[PDB]
Amino acid sequence: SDPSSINGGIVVAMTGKDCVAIACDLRLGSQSLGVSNKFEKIFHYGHVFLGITGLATDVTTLNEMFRYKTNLYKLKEERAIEPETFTQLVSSSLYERRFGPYFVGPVVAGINSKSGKPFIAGFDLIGCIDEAKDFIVSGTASDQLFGMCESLYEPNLEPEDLFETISQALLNAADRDALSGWGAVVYIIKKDEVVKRYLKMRQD
Amino acid sequence: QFNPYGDNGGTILGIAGEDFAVLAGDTRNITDYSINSRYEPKVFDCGDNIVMSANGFAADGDALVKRFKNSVKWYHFDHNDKKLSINSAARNIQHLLYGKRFFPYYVHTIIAGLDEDGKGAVYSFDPVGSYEREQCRAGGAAASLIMPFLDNQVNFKNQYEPGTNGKVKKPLKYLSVEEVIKLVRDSFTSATERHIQVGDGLEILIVTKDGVRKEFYELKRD
Amino acid sequence: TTLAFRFQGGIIVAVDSRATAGNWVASQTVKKVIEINPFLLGTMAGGAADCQFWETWLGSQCRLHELREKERISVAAASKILSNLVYQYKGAGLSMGTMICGYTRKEGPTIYYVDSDGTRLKGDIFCVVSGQTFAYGVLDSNYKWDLSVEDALYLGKRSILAAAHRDAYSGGSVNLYHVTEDGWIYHGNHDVGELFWKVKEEEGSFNNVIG
Amino acid sequence: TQQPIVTGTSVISMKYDNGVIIAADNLGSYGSLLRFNGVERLIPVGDNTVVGISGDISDMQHIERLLKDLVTENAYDNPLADAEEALEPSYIFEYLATVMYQRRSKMNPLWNAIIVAGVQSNGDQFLRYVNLLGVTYSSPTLATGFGAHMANPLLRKVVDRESDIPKTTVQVAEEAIVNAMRVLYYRDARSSRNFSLAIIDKNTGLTFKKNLQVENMKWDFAKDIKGYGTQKI
Amino acid sequence: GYDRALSIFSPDGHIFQVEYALEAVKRGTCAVGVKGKNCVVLGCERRSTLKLQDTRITPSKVSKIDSHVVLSFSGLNADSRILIEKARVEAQSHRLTLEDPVTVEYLTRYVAGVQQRYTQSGGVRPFGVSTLIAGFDPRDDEPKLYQTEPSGIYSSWSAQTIGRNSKTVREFLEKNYDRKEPPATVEECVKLTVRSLLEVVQTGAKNIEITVVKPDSDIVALSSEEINQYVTQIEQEKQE
Amino acid sequence: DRGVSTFSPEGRLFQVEYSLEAIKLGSTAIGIATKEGVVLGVEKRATSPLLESDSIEKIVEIDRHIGCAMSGLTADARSMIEHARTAAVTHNLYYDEDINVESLTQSVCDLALRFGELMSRPFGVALLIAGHDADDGYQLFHAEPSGTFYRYNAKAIGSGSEGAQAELLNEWHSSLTLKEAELLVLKILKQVMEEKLDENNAQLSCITKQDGFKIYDNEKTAELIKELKEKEAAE
Amino acid sequence: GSRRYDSRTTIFSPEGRLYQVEYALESISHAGTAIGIMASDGIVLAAERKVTSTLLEQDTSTEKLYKLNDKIAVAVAGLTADAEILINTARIHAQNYLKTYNEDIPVEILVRRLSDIKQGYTQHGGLRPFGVSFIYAGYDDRYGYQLYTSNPSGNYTGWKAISVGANTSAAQTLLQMDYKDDMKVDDAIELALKTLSKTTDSSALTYDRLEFATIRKGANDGEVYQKIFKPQEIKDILVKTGIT
Amino acid sequence: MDIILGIRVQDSVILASSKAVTRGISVLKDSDDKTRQLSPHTLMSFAGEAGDTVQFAEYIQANIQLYSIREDYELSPQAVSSFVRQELAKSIRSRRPYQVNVLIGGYDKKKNKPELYQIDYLGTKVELPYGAHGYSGFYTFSLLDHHYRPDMTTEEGLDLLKLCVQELEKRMPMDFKGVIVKIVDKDGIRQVDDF
Amino acid sequence: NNYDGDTVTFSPTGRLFQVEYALEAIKQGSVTVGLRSNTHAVLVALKRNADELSSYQKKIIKCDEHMGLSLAGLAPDARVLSNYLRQQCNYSSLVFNRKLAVERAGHLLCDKAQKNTQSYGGRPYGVGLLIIGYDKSGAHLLEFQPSGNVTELYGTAIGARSQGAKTYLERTLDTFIKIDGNPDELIKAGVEAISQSLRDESLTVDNLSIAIVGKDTPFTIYDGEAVAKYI
């Protein structure tokens, strides 16, 4: 009945020393029934990464919509969109459906190509912006992720250290949510290399 | 909230003879337990030897009768003053009723006249325009009291030839206008006794080849 | 109660004639078969007005097809005109259960069930017993493909009688139609009151009655 | 679809030998509060018609403006506006009836009950009723709200049928109306003592009486009533 | 919106915009239709003024409307695309509502209807296009060939040609096509179509396109070499 | 340029008067009304011998009791026929009966003057509308792009009209049989046609109360042509 | 009324030509020459900027070669402003197709749509046609490398090699002479520059008067790269081919 | 309720769909085919609200057939699935959404690979080895999660599907009156008579 | 000349030529007469045939039970304007329970015609109408011109050779106005009036069309052997 918890799933993003990390689970369900364990929730438009939790039809629709908009941006601007600017485009796009909104919890992660400054942001379904220095959480286990991040996180973590922190934050949060899990992916993002790792976790 | 419908009571009766037809109704208009009028006609001459009554919500009945009267006027204009046949009138009224399918006319419609062969005809409609041709029809609040009487006394239903013990049905026969008027008067007299919304007066419109004539009889005012 | 089944001799269509408002019996002479064209029949179940109006409208649309294409409309095409129309009004509260029956050289004997829900189905037999639509007859035991026309007429008549007796909202008289190559034929109206007693005496069935 | 806020109670009327009489109290109630006194609810149209209105007062003031606008419009390019082509009671009624039924059919009604009283060109008495549903009817006596329940029974004892209208004088008819207004003051919790009365006669024309009061009231018997059964003091 | 009446009558009762549209057709590359006993062949001219052309990707002159009906044209190429698109949409619309593919006559009547509408609608000019519409009706073995023109009139033809020098190739067909005995085989029908184009084309190289439509949605376009074999055999018989 | 709805100094609409010229260039159509029925005949006029003549449709059914022959820009007629068929069926839906021939004609003529700056120009085609109804019996009407219609005992339109009309003026009487009317249409068509009249380049049709509107077979018309030739050779 | 002042932009001439289309084609014949050459292993787009100045910022300038997506580019000949209206429409259609089917638009489908828009301006609306001719260079996995052209009429055709704008007659003769089917991109680059160098109305062909682009499978493995040449890169390929 | 199952084997896609049409406590048909051929190598099975199911499938069939005629090319299953999802994703925020759940089985001739897509009435899409809609989902899934092998043949796939239907008949409370089975491979779409 | 291209253009002398051309269409039309007493109002119309096989074009149209007109000019334009009168008469009846005054029917025709003379793209009406009626102020006769000018008259005539009938009525004014409660004699005066506009042709049984409305007489049209009495 509640659109934002029919399909389930989670996203978390963190900042480190000259790096950012974004991670998600792989589950898609019809409430109690698990349908797919290959439903990735993190998309990238150039060097800007977008995670989306919530109603899965809207996750897919918004991915197709932002691919569309960032493609037209790049053709007109003659450069890839930056995290700060994409954040404003997500917000704009969500608030134009104010009274008929997409039932989603978007998360932006990426490094500004010019300033080299790590950047993360989160949004509500109507496009309010949460621009935290430390970490952003989204999905059916947001309460669990807030708990894990608030205790595990310390500032200025090296890439290989930040990986362990965000991985343990996701895995332990997902295991306390019925509608999250069935695998997980972690993106470690540096200025000019991105590593993608699939985590071994419980399939119940 | 605001309720767009009301009930003004009353009862209408249409009987078709071999070479005539009658449409009758009580002249009483009510709301709730109050009497609005003891004489407010509900059976109208619509031209081309057609008599029409829309019984139920009085507002919807007045509107529908107006639209049909208008419909007859434009038939003459658009078709070189062709007489509107009862079957054509019936089909036209169906389209009028069905137009408001999702905001219906809360009325029971009966029209009487002569068919193209000169035989008496009665047509009966539901609120949303379903219609059928019949020998007998009663509409309105007291329809349930009158229709069984008409089944028994006009169509001779559940009547058999004495001495056959149900082997042979009573022969169907065409009633005279005088016999039909008696049944109409008896039906309304009976309905007035047992229905609170029926009384005050009875107005009968008789349709023949010669035209439309009107008879009025007083009913109990309690 | 409306019944339409397919056999070697063509299509048998049998309907009752009772109309009700709640428990009130408004009519026992209602015509629940509309003769769209010499080769096309429509049965009516659900709202009396909805069925009468739109099946009469279908006859108009079928007539226009004949004019524009100099050919009889196919039962498939005629059924889909009605099915596509009701689908536009879906959720507005139209109540319609209907079977479009005809014979054409292209398709042979064909029955299509068309619903107010927008359901359109082709089948050999369709039955509507108050509020319920079935792909089987009220009896269905006697049904074999190779049946005498006059034998098949009786099954259809007997099937309406079965439902008329048990179902409170079915009754009045039975209207019979036979659909073949070169058009349909009316097989008369049979009052259930007279029919019941005759059938009982001849068949030795309805023993639970007493008379 | 709305709810009525400021409201007017009964309008009562009847036919007599030579014309028609209509009356209504001068109150505009805001629920249980008797807020506006001196509200006129009988609105004359020319010298041959009076329109009495009960129900929502904001809707009444709208209808008042439609009628004022109807007189203006009728005069336009009409040399016989004050003669053969003057507004008839029957014309004014059919217009209001049309508006009332159209407004109900758009589910946005004028929350009123209306009685049109007047005399026609040929001297025929006109008296017809219409309300928020567009329901219409005529009778030798007509009344809205509480009037229907209490006034009609009293007026129907003077004119019970059509044949009684020639036998009913203006003095007898006015007496019956004034008495009915006193009964409504006794028994309607939304009535006032102050009312307006209008006579439309085929000979003497339109007589409009304002600032009429219910008089000759019976209260003296109240002093002798103590308690609700067993109390003696 | 632009309402201006561009197709109007003249004092001699002619609609010049419709007649000038026929002039656009006259300028177009030649198209010919021939129906045999059990087939219809559509021959089309390719003007050899354009070489360095990519024949793989260049719009072909014969367009499938459905699996069983084809449309060729003479006139404005751009205009033809709009009629082809509308026809293809109507073909699927007919299948969807009637549960049967269009008859050749029905598809023709539709395209002809569109052409007519653009002769008495404000703010629009007529189509500078004539069409040959060929195919077989569903479950029928009787060949069908129809012609349409900018005015909107249409009719059925044993054989017909449209476009530049159509007067010449119609002359050929009128003396060479026998109604009592039409081309019995595919070979005979293709031969007569290639022969009719060779009266006008120039070189029998990449200038002639041939499309054979047989009953039951059997449509194939002949290759360069296949057509070249017909061109060779015709001239070797002519040398006598 | 100038308005499409412009009047001439003589008080005639330019575009209407010009359309009447287009109709004069059209193939001949003849109608004869009798007490036994109404006959409709047309010249097909194929532009080439390769054109399959039976595909030339200039006589058209509107309803079972109303036929229609056309002359002029015949493509313009398709939407008029479409409207006529829709009007005839729609009236039968609303009133459960056959539409009067005059009412159907009046409906078609209401399209005529719906042009301006609605459609961009008048229709370039005239119609002969033949039918039967119970009120006024067998009827023949001439519908013009002006919006005017006249009833006729007999009428010819198209290229050979004024020659044909003068022939109909002499030949028509109130006692004509249907067989006489058929031969008379064939006789006058054969007179005004360029090519020699046969069953392939001319087409007959009639409307009777009993059988309704029928387009004649080529085999049936062929026999009436042979019957005509013999009776003309008989004196 | 307003009829008096209407040019009637969508009528036939007595010869059955479209006045405004014919006049638009006359306009385009004065525009800088654009050439497209299709090879087995890629496509070349070469175009000539119209009489430039020494004070024109060339490195940030674009008038001839425009990107429609990652797989399709166009060379322009005519009104630059008119072209940009159509280019933005094409860019949106390409992204509409990708959103609907989740596949890059086939080259012909994009070409047909832009051509169908042009056609409309010639048949209805009473507006002037677009004064633009396009050369489309594109790759898809159905037909591989493809060259198309469209003109104000809305007609489009496919090509192995083609020219639009000024001196096309001369350009097309030179291409028809030196083009072979087994030709490679490096060869096609040389042909394109040699053709412009001979057809140009300018005294000499220099880097500051050219826009150049290649679409190569010369992208690491099984994919396609678009290269819009920088001023310094156009200068280098002019020395390599031996024109300066 | 209606059973629609899909299994993708090594070289084909098999779709099993229940043959019964029921509205309330009435069985309207026992031979219903809940499938539409979108293209020669693409098949769609649908379950949902009466009327919406057929109307949606026929609407999608017409659009895919139009594309095929216009481009003389067959849209890839990935492309057809994306088009279908987007039509459903439009309909959820429409005045009256289509209540249809579909399975799309197709053979991609370019990649020479069979593909199965599951899409719900909201426009939720996933690519799966096996899929199903409704109550029959929970059972079949777990059964297939145990038996399905990626390199299974068409014959092996049919046996596993045969097992799923048999187990569904015992375990399901409603009578779905058997299934119709259709195979999608390189050669095209065929119906398995024996089942 | 240069100022007759459309209806939106005044000439240098302040004339509207398109309107004047429309006025010409009427003069080409067949003759129709109108006259009234205090009790009755009569229309007499000469119908025109195409040829001897053809019918005689109907001239008189009923608008309501108490009102109707005769036409001269474009018949389709009479159909449009008569349909508009039918609607306005109908609106008055339904909304106000009031028979529309003849004078107010005139005012409405005038205002409808005017709009077509002041706007680009449109054209003036090409027909002239004689409206007769009986209302609450007795018998009325109106003349309509598509300029918009509507005039109340005792009698008049429009169409070809109308001047003959108009002169006769101008002499007979004092006689035919006094023909009260005698319908036959008022029609005789109308038939004798239209007779003054005939040349070569005379009034036959299928040629003559008469209509009458009065105190106790609904608007009725007489054609065929019903007018043989007056020949």
Query: Cβ atoms within 10 A of the Cβ of I178, count?
Result: 10
SS3 letters across chain E = CCCCCCCCCCCCCCCHHHHHHHHHHHHCCCEEEEECCCCEEEEEECCCCCCCECCCCCCCCCEECCCCEEEEEEECHHHHHHHHHHHHHHHHHHHHHHCCCCCHHHHHHHHHHHHHHCCCCCCECCCCEEEEEEECCCCCCCCEEEEECCCCCEEEECEEEECCCHHHHHHHHHHHCCCCCCCCCHHHHHHHHHHHHHCCCCCCCCCEEEEEEECCCEEEECCHHHHHHHHHHHHHHHCC
Range of the domain at D12: 1-233
Asked if B80 reaches chain F (Cβ–Cβ under 8 Å), the answer is yes
Place of tokens 């319609």: C96
Nearby residues of A88 by Cβ (< 8 Å), 6 or more positions away: none
The pair of three-digit structure tokens given for residue C143, joined into one six-digit string = 């049904």
CA distance linking residue D139 with residue D161, whole number of Å = 9
Inspect the interface and report whether the beta carbons of D104 and B4 lie closer than 8 Å.
yes
Tell me how many degrees the CA angle C188-C189-C195 measures, rounded to the nearest 5: 115
Q: Span A1-204: which CATH code?
A: 3.60.20.10
Nearby residues of D198 by Cβ (< 8 Å), 6 or more positions away: D21, D22, D23, D42, D44, D50, D117, D206, D207, D208, D209
Cβ contact H84:H119 at 8 Å: yes
Backbone angles phi and psi of H85, in degrees to 5: -55, -50
Note the residue count of chain H. Answer: 195
CA distance linking residue D213 with residue D203, whole number of Å = 27
The pair of three-digit structure tokens given for residue I195, joined into one six-digit string = 């007779």
Helix axes E104-117, E77-98, angle to 10 degrees: 130
The pair of three-digit structure tokens given for residue F144, joined into one six-digit string = 């013009």
- Consult the annotation and say whether C49 binds a ligand: no
Asked if G6 reaches chain I (Cβ–Cβ under 8 Å), the answer is no
Residue I98 with chain D: CB contacts under 8 Å: 88, 91, 94
CA distance linking residue A61 with residue A81, whole number of Å = 20
Tell me how many degrees the CA angle C134-C137-C138 measures, rounded to the nearest 5: 100
The pair of three-digit structure tokens given for residue D91, joined into one six-digit string = 């014309």
Query: Cβ atoms within 10 A of the Cβ of B168, count?
Result: 11
CA distance linking residue I150 with residue I195, whole number of Å = 25
- In single-letter form, the type of residue at position C148 comes to S
Inspect the interface and report whether the beta carbons of G14 and E20 lie closer than 8 Å.
yes
The pair of three-digit structure tokens given for residue B113, joined into one six-digit string = 């006249």
CA distance linking residue I211 with residue I209, whole number of Å = 7
D75 SS3 class: helix
CA distance linking residue I68 with residue I89, whole number of Å = 10
Inspect the interface and report whether the beta carbons of E106 and C76 lie closer than 8 Å.
no
- Give me the number of domains chain E comprises: 1
Beta bridge partners of E129: E75
Among A6, A8, A9, CA closest to A23: A9
CA distance linking residue C140 with residue G131, whole number of Å = 75
Place of tokens 């020098």: E165
Place of tokens 């897919």: A60
Inspect the interface and report whether the beta carbons of H23 and C121 lie closer than 8 Å.
no
Nearby residues of G7 by Cβ (< 8 Å), 6 or more positions away: none
Distances from the Cα of C103 to the Cα of C108, C175, C180, C183, F228, angstroms: 5, 19, 6, 7, 43
Q: For residue D1, indicate whether it is catalytic.
A: yes
Residue F116 with chain G: CB contacts under 8 Å: none
Residue C77 with chain E: CB contacts under 8 Å: 97-100
CATH label of the domain that carries residue E236 = 3.60.20.10
SS3 breakdown of chain G: % helix, strand, coil, rounded to 5? 35, 25, 40
Inspect the interface and report whether the beta carbons of I123 and F110 lie closer than 8 Å.
no
Asked if H75 reaches chain G (Cβ–Cβ under 8 Å), the answer is yes
Residue G220 burial (10 A CB sphere; 0-12, 13-18, 19+):
exposed
Distances from the Cα of E227 to the Cα of E6, E53, E187, angstroms: 44, 19, 11
Backbone angles phi and psi of H48, in degrees to 5: 160, -155
- Annotated catalytic residue, options D1, D72, D168, D204: D1
Cα dihedral sign for H31, H37, H38, H44? Answer: positive
Q: What is the DSSP letter of D206?
A: E
CA distance linking residue F162 with residue F140, whole number of Å = 18
Residue E70 burial (10 A CB sphere; 0-12, 13-18, 19+):
buried
The pair of three-digit structure tokens given for residue F161, joined into one six-digit string = 């009209």
- Do A and H make contact via 3 or more CB pairs under 8 A? The reply is yes
Among H69, C65, H39, CA closest to E68: H69
Residue D228 burial (10 A CB sphere; 0-12, 13-18, 19+):
exposed
Strand order in the sheet with F137-143: F59-63, F66-72, F125-133, F137-143, F149-151
Residue E8 burial (10 A CB sphere; 0-12, 13-18, 19+):
buried
Tell me how many degrees the CA angle C154-C158-C162 measures, rounded to the nearest 5: 175
Distance from CA of F162 to the nearest CA of E (A): 18
CA distance linking residue I229 with residue I231, whole number of Å = 6
Residue C81 burial (10 A CB sphere; 0-12, 13-18, 19+):
buried
Cα dihedral sign for A31, A32, A34, A39? Answer: positive
Residue C64 with chain F: CB contacts under 8 Å: 85-86, 89
Q: How many helices (H) and strands (E) does chain F have?
A: 6, 10
Cβ contact C113:C99 at 8 Å: yes
G8: phi > 0 → left, psi -120 to 50 → alpha, else beta; which? left
Residue G101 with chain H: CB contacts under 8 Å: 75, 79, 82-83
Backbone angles phi and psi of G127, in degrees to 5: -100, 160
CA distance linking residue B205 with residue B23, whole number of Å = 5
Cβ contact I131:B103 at 8 Å: no
Backbone angles phi and psi of G166, in degrees to 5: -75, 140
CATH label of the domain that carries residue F114 = 3.60.20.10
> Of chain D residues 68-107, which have a CB less than 8 A from chain B?
101, 104-105, 107
Inspect the interface and report whether the beta carbons of F62 and C67 lie closer than 8 Å.
yes
Tell me how many degrees the CA angle B158-B161-B162 measures, rounded to the nearest 5: 110
Strand order in the sheet with G42-48: G161-164, G34-39, G42-48, G210-216, G225-228
Which chains pack against D, by 3+ Cβ pairs within 8 A? B, I
Cβ contact I199:I28 at 8 Å: no
- For chain C, the C-alpha Rg in angstroms (whole number) is 17
Asked if B87 reaches chain F (Cβ–Cβ under 8 Å), the answer is yes
Domains of chain H, each with CATH number or no CATH: 1-195 (3.60.20.10)
CA distance linking residue B70 with residue B64, whole number of Å = 10
The pair of three-digit structure tokens given for residue B51, joined into one six-digit string = 């008599």
Asked if G222 reaches chain H (Cβ–Cβ under 8 Å), the answer is no
Inspect the interface and report whether the beta carbons of G99 and A65 lie closer than 8 Å.
yes
CA distance linking residue H139 with residue A164, whole number of Å = 37
Longest dimension (CA), chain A: 47
Cβ contact H118:H71 at 8 Å: no
Asked if A156 reaches chain H (Cβ–Cβ under 8 Å), the answer is no
Beta bridge partners of C109: C103
Q: What is the DSSP letter of A81?
A: P
Nearby residues of E138 by Cβ (< 8 Å), 6 or more positions away: E68, E100, E101, E103
Cα dihedral sign for F154, F155, F161, F166? Answer: positive
Q: What determination technique applies here?
A: X-ray
The pair of three-digit structure tokens given for residue H166, joined into one six-digit string = 């048999």
Inspect the interface and report whether the beta carbons of H123 and A36 lie closer than 8 Å.
no
CA distance linking residue G181 with residue C182, whole number of Å = 67
Asked if E1 reaches chain F (Cβ–Cβ under 8 Å), the answer is no
- Give me the number of domains chain F comprises: 1
The architecture of the domain spanning B1-222 is 4-Layer Sandwich (3.60)
Distances from the Cα of F235 to the Cα of B30, E76, F191, angstroms: 86, 59, 18
Residue I83 burial (10 A CB sphere; 0-12, 13-18, 19+):
middle
Domains of chain G, each with CATH number or no CATH: 1-244 (3.60.20.10)
Q: How many helices (H) and strands (E) does chain G have?
A: 6, 10
CA distance linking residue E157 with residue C32, whole number of Å = 49
Helix axes F77-95, C48-69, angle to 10 degrees: 150
Q: Report the run of H or E that residue C90 belongs to, with start and end.
A: none
Distances from the Cα of H43 to the Cα of A160, B170, H15, H80, angstroms: 47, 66, 8, 10
Distances from the Cα of A176 to the Cα of A171, A204, F89, F213, angstroms: 9, 11, 70, 82
CA distance linking residue A56 with residue A64, whole number of Å = 12
Beta bridge partners of H42: H39, H106
- Do I and C make contact via 3 or more CB pairs under 8 A? The reply is no
CA distance linking residue C5 with residue G188, whole number of Å = 74
Which of I53, I119, I147 is the mutation pick for testing F, counting most F CBs within 10 A?
A: I53
Which chains pack against C, by 3+ Cβ pairs within 8 A? B, E, F, H
The pair of three-digit structure tokens given for residue C65, joined into one six-digit string = 């097809």
Distance from CA of E76 to the nearest CA of G (A): 8
| Alpha helices (H) along A113-203 | 142-152, 159-174
Q: Report the run of H or E that residue B30 belongs to, with start and end.
A: strand B29-31
Query: Cβ atoms within 10 A of the Cβ of F98, count?
Result: 18
Cβ contact F156:F171 at 8 Å: no
Residue E102 with chain C: CB contacts under 8 Å: none
Distance from CA of F120 to the nearest CA of G (A): 13
**Which residues of chain I are at the F interface, by a Cβ-Cβ cutoff of 8 Å?**
4-7, 17-18, 21-28, 49-55, 57, 73-77, 79, 121-124, 126
CA distance linking residue E220 with residue E227, whole number of Å = 13
Among A204, A134, A132, CA closest to A175: A204
Nearby residues of D209 by Cβ (< 8 Å), 6 or more positions away: D196, D197, D198, D199
- Do D and E make contact via 3 or more CB pairs under 8 A? The reply is no
Range of the domain at E184: 1-240
A105 SS3 class: strand
CA distance linking residue B182 with residue B189, whole number of Å = 10
Q: Report the run of H or E that residue G28 belongs to, with start and end.
A: helix G19-28
Distance from CA of F102 to the nearest CA of I (A): 12
F134 SS3 class: coil
The gap between the terminal CA atoms of chain A, to the nearest Å, is 23
- Give me the number of domains chain D comprises: 1
- Do I and B make contact via 3 or more CB pairs under 8 A? The reply is yes
- In single-letter form, the type of residue at position E77 comes to N
Domain regions of chain B by residue span: 1-222
Nearby residues of C193 by Cβ (< 8 Å), 6 or more positions away: none
Cβ contact H103:H3 at 8 Å: no
CATH 3.60.20.10 fits I1-231, yes or no: yes
Residue B58 with chain D: CB contacts under 8 Å: 135-137
The pair of three-digit structure tokens given for residue G147, joined into one six-digit string = 């060259």
Cα dihedral sign for I72, I75, I81, I85? Answer: positive
Tell me how many degrees the CA angle G161-G167-G171 measures, rounded to the nearest 5: 30
Q: What is the DSSP string of C116-179?
A: TTS-EEE-SEEEEETTEEESS-SS-SS--SS--HHHHHHHHHHHHHHHHHH-TT--SEEEEEEE
Inspect the interface and report whether the beta carbons of C29 and B94 lie closer than 8 Å.
no
- In single-letter form, the type of residue at position A52 comes to I
Q: What is the DSSP letter of D182?
A: H
H117 SS3 class: strand
Residue A113 burial (10 A CB sphere; 0-12, 13-18, 19+):
middle
CA distance linking residue E181 with residue G184, whole number of Å = 55
CA distance linking residue F139 with residue F145, whole number of Å = 20
